[PDB]
Design a protein around this ligand. Structure first.
Ligand SMILES: O=C(O)c1cc2cc(Cl)ccc2[nH]1
Ligand SMILES: [Ca+2]
Lengths: 55, 251
């Protein structure tokens, strides 16, 4: 599932035994209940530009 | 950077400036509060290992505005496969003596997972390259941080579209333009090749080498960071060792 459009994940994707897929996030992020989206858990998450975010 | 634009202040917050005895050496990328990724070739001629400084939150080299954070470089880690004076395995992992403080102007770039980088990020066409390097081939270096959008090429296409020259290995990738208008340059070495994917930026390349700067029929060559993710992750989980320079086995 992960090879095709990143398995629908916003960030990281892990393939599991069967048609099972788990999305994961970089540190400073948490996975939403949709199972695909990553939300920041810190003030300065990696790869986000604060001056653009606070606009 | 040739043919780019000034990166508005705070828009490249992971950009690192490396200094040796206060003189501009190379660029780098902040990947968390104590680690910086740069190019191994930046360190081929260092003798004053104690005088290596990383500056974060830098924008304009002519003025101190209070957002700059300077840290001594405690360790420079190079893969065992890198040979000085050559281009292959052109990567260095730097440990800062003390963490930088994350602010609106100092933010790390995401070091992605290998699989995500190989099967998804490697297919994003355009990515940004940045630095205070030469604005022209045989020209002066920039006073303000510059940024350029460059498209990535498949290595077959790079070798076909290109005019003693080094080979393009699996530890590299080509990006840029062959019309001589836009490229990264000498003094941008070690800086980030950053890729946007679903609202977040990731580290995909390191400014490594090329035939001059913006030479017709030639593209910029970048270190393929995806090949080094596990090597970088294992080092970041390890205890510091005496001595600034450390050669670590690769793979
Ligand atoms: O030192 C140089 O001449 C040099 C380094 C470098 C790096 C890229 Cl990615 C493109 C062009 C370049 N020229
Ligand atoms: Ca400044």
């Amino acid at each position: 599932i992960c090879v095709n459009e990143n398995g629908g994940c916003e960030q990281y994707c892990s393939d599991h035994t069967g048609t099972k897929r788990s999305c994961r996030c970089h540190e400073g992020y948490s996975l939403l209940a949709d199972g695909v989206s990553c939300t920041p858990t810190v003030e300065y998450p990696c790869g986000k530009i604060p001056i653009l975010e606070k606009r | 950077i040739v043919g780019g634009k000034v990166c508005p202040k705070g828009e490249c917050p992971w950009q690192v400036l490396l200094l040796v005895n206060g003189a501009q050496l190379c660029g780098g990328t902040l990947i968390n509060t104590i680690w910086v990724v740069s190019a191994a070739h930046c360190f081929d001629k260092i003798k004053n290992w104690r005088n290596l400084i990383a500056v974060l939150g830098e924008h304009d080299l002519s003025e101190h505005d209070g957002d700059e954070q300077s840290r001594r470089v405690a360790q420079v880690i190079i893969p065992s496969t890198y040979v000085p004076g050559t281009t292959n395995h052109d990567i260095a992992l730097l440990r800062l003596h003390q963490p930088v403080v994350l602010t609106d102007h100092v933010v790390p770039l995401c070091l992605p997972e290998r699989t995500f980088s190989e099967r998804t990020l490697a297919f994003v066409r355009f990515s940004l390259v940045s630095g205070w390097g030469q604005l022209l081939d045989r020209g002066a270096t920039a006073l303000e941080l510059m940024v350029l959008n460059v498209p990535r090429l498949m290595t077959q296409d790079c070798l076909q579209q290109s005019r003693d020259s080094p080979n393009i290995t699996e530890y590299m990738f080509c990006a840029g333009y062959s019309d001589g208008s836009k490229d990264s340059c000498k003094g941008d070495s070690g800086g980030p090749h950053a890729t946007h994917y679903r609202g977040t930026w990731y580290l995909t390349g390191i400014v490594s080498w090329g035939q001059g700067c913006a030479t017709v029929g030639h593209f910029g060559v970048y270190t393929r960071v995806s090949q080094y993710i596990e090597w970088l992750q294992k080092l970041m989980r390890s205890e510091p060792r005496p001595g600034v320079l450390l050669r670590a086995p690769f793979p």
